[model samples]
Target: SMSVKKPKRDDSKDLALCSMILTEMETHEDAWPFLLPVNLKLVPGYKKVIKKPMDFSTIREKLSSGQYPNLETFALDVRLVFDNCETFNEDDSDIGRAGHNMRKYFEKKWTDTFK
Candidate 1:
């Protein structure tokens, strides 16, 4: 009845997959932007555009709680990490370039391991 990737991963496998993805994403060369939220004082008007700031550090913090009931929950914030970037950082912006690269792992790579 399923037409997509396998859905056999239980809570443990789910956490492991999500944890590794975050590690890979966080350790990437162009990871500075999403590693932590922008310094509000350093970047003027940042809050004006990004209301719900998301980052790798924050996500790891939340993951420690293990309250993520579903793999989907983990990606919600992960997607936010990418979304807020393209929203605030223009495609040509240096941070924006890394955003695409990071999302690349989340899309194909994340799913491959997810399966």
Candidate 2:
């Protein structure tokens, strides 16, 4: 029997947080690879797929279309991408600096948006 999938619960608060985080990260150079086209050999038929690190609007569309289970998961995964960056010298590294800036953007803009 075929089963229907119900829409996932919407966490507006977390969703907005994820959106802000992704928007800030997108402006980073090292993060660009996430948006770039890459080969996807694991899939059954398709050879390529636009991997994660998508823009805010594109992600938003996907979220609305049920591509993601929820925004919290999305945010965590996005953070995982940055967390994977090699930052030997903390603030001195490119990815480190970018990550700091993204956090700042998240704090500043998130505050501005909510309050």
Candidate 3:
């Protein structure tokens, strides 16, 4: 039987990077508006829905647990959250730019780590 080798995965720096980005989001006035949407619930039903405040805490919490299969998977998970967000790529908007900044940081970090 042949054995497969898995790529090296490190959660330390990635976790720290996530924390840094979260700190920026919490401290940056423009970031809150952009970051607060991941936790919301949307409904197209006869009844109205009460949603939780939007935020990336859930993702952060999961990452903090260090349960991801690999750094790349973690990176993808992070992007998935922003991928559904309209404001994440709004280059002309303050919140958009803020989100973009974080995206760039992660992109670079992931590339550096995986490459």
Candidate 4:
């Protein structure tokens, strides 16, 4: 038996997993609210409330460009989308509920793959 444990597979497979995760997220019906940037389109104070705006489009671009050093970091950014949703639309059922829905979906998807 021989063992060769390098980080090559992680890089390769991690991107693969990330790609599917992002693709499925876009497929999710509730993703409508987070398909693109809305910082300037919405209330001006929204920017101050959410400094680091994240959405499906931006994540996909960054993923394609290899902006993240690791998949977990990318996951964190995705989670930020849900977090910001809750913060911005805390009182709205449509937006906030979708946030929880996507967040829950992402959690399960992540667990099934990485766990």
* RMSD per model, one decimal: 4.2, 9.2, 5.5, 3.8
Rank ordering of all candidates by TM-score, starting from the highest: 4, 1, 3, 2
Q: Write one digit per residue (lDDT tens) for candidate 3, span 27-113.
A: 655456445444334434212332222346665666678766555665565675455444334567665676666667667755664
TM-score of 1: 0.84
Per-residue lDDT for 40 in model 2?
48
Clashing pairs in 2: none
Clashing residue pairs in candidate 1 (N, C-alpha, C atoms within 3 angstroms): none
Where is model 2 poorest over a 10-residue stretch in terms of lDDT?
A: 45-54
> How well is each residue in 3-74 modelled by candidate 4, as lDDT tens digits?
865554545688888899889999999899899987576567887778888999999999999898898889
- lDDT by residue (1-115, candidate 1, tens digit) is 5787876645667788788888988888888888886788888778888888889998999998876778888888999999988988789978899899888878886678765
For each candidate in turn, the TM-score is 0.84, 0.42, 0.52, 0.86
Candidate 3: which pairs clash? 36-54, 37-54
Q: How far does residue 18 in candidate 3 sit from its true spot (Å)?
A: 6.7
Cα lDDT of model 2 by residue, 1-115, tens digit: 2687777654567655656655665665655434532234543322332234333455556655666776546655555444433222256866567656555655565456544
The deviation in Å at residue 76 for candidate 2 is 0.7
Best by lDDT: 4
Model 3 RMSD in Å is 5.5
Residue-pair clashes per prediction, in order, are 0, 0, 2, 0
